[PDB]
Amino acid sequence: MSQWYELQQLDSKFLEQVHQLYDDSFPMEIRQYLAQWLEKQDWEHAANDVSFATIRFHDLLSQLDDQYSRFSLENNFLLQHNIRKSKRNLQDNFQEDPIQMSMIIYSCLKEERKILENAQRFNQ
């Protein structure tokens, strides 16, 4: 039932739009691995409140630790490595001004809904 799952069922024309959305904005790997958690958070509020955005930034890093422990149980060495790279890059890219990560995440989720809007309107 996740928005991420629904996006993946669209036709290639609209999947191409999702590709372009995730060209150097927010890492699509994290968007997928934390889909359920990301889709729960009030990124709109975080995008307008530095203290809340700071908590959500560090919440996200800890959620990636939880993902890591699942992939480790699954003996998935590459995704273990990718989770660790993902965490490092997020900290490099966003820790100085974490509110900007929330602005980007909210915006991506917004654009995803607009793409879904196209797909249901185009389907008729």
Binding site: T54, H58, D59, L61, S62, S69, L73, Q91, Q95, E96
Partner: protein
């Protein structure tokens, strides 16, 4: 930051990291239990070791960002994350050990 990178490499591959994760395991056993401390205590041992090293690295990179960092800067960056640590008691424990490791390699 050169010594940060070597500190982190020591944490993952060196005896420094074995000492770190044994300290953390006992401190997390000894703390008043939370859902998060219980899930760490229930992890398979090799996975727990990896997560604890990763959790320590997260706080090291919080306290030390840039080669320009001086120990004066530690206090602001700790207070910036203090409200987070208040709702994450396990992370408070790990931040204390990262603070000691980080202080010994900065200004």
């Amino acid at each position: 930051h050169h010594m940060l990178e070597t500190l982190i490499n020591k944490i993952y591959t060196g005896p420094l990291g074995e000492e770190l994760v044994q300290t953390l395991y006992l401190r997390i056993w000894a703390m008043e239990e939370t859902p998060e401390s219980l899930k760490i205590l229930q992890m398979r041992e090799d996975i727990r070791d990896q997560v604890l090293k990763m959790k320590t690295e997260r706080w090291l990179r919080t306290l030390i960002r840039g080669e320009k960092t001086k120990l004066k800067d530690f206090q602001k960056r700790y207070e910036e994350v203090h409200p987070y640590l208040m709702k994450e008691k396990v992370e408070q424990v790990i931040m204390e050990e990262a603070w000691s490791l980080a202080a010994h390699i900065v200004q």
